[PDB]
Every structure is written in structure tokens, then in C-alpha cells.
Amino acid sequence: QTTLPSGLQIGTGVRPVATERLHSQGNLSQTNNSKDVAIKGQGFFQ
Amino acid sequence: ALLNIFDIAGSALAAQSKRLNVAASNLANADSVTGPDGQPYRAKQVVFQVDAAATGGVKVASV
């Protein structure tokens, strides 16, 4: 009555799709310079 | 009849072929499971018997 479905399905393999960057917030280290700036939050210079 | 030798040898060859086929089938189904209708697979053997026509050939009654 109840048996296994008896079906075949062969895989092929694995491929890399993407590399996501963790755009988190990094720590701030003091360089004591007067012409260095750091971003707090989001945003990029141009 | 000096010609029943061929019959005896042919029966022996057929019996040996049957036994080899059974052994090969068992080896193929060594690690099988859940055959038709779900009943588990079970191994089988053959039994040789002589045809008392005295001296006679070999036969396999059933598996």
C-alpha cells in the first residue's frame, strides 16, 4: 500500500552566485591628525 | 544410449547457469530495500536434485 515514491532526480553541482559585503559600522581609531575624517552612519565620499 | 551423456551435461550446464544467475541477482540486491509493493527483499537459493530415470542428470525444482 504505502511505499517510497520511487523517483530519480540527479543533482549537478554547486556554483558561487554572489559575494555580499557587510556594510556595517566599523570602529573609530584616533590618528591625532587634523586632516582626517570618519563617517558616522551611511554615506560615501566622491 | 551413449547419447544421454549430452543430456546429462546439458542439464548440468543449465543448473549451474541458474545457480550463477541467482548468486549474481543476490549480489546485485545486496543493499536494496523496499521492492515492489513495499515488501522487503529476501535472498533466494536453489536446490539441486537428481533425475532417477539409477544415474541421471541434475535439475532445480524451485527457488
Do the beta carbons of residue B34 and residue A4 sit within 8 Å?
yes
Alpha carbons A18 and B58: distance in angstroms, whole number: 70
Chain B residues with beta carbon closer than 8 angstroms to that of A1: 37-38
Residue A44, CB half-sphere, CA atoms under 13 Å: how many? 2
B39 touches chain A (CB under 8 A): no
> Residue A42: what are its φ and ψ, rounded to 5°?
-105, 160
CB under 8 Å, gap of 24 or more: what pairs does B1-8 form? B7/B57, B8/B56, B8/B57
Please provide the DSSP assignment of chain B as one string.
---HHHHHHHHHHHHHHHHHHHHHHHHHTTT----GGGPPP------EEE-------EEE---
Q: Which residues of A touch B (CB under 8 A)?
A: 1-4
Alpha carbons B25 and B35: distance in angstroms, whole number: 14
Chain B residues with beta carbon closer than 8 angstroms to that of A3: 34, 37-38
Residue in chain B nearest A2 by alpha carbon: B38
Hey, what's the cell of A21? Answer: 559585503
The sign of the torsion formed by the CA atoms of A38, A40, A41, A46 equals: negative
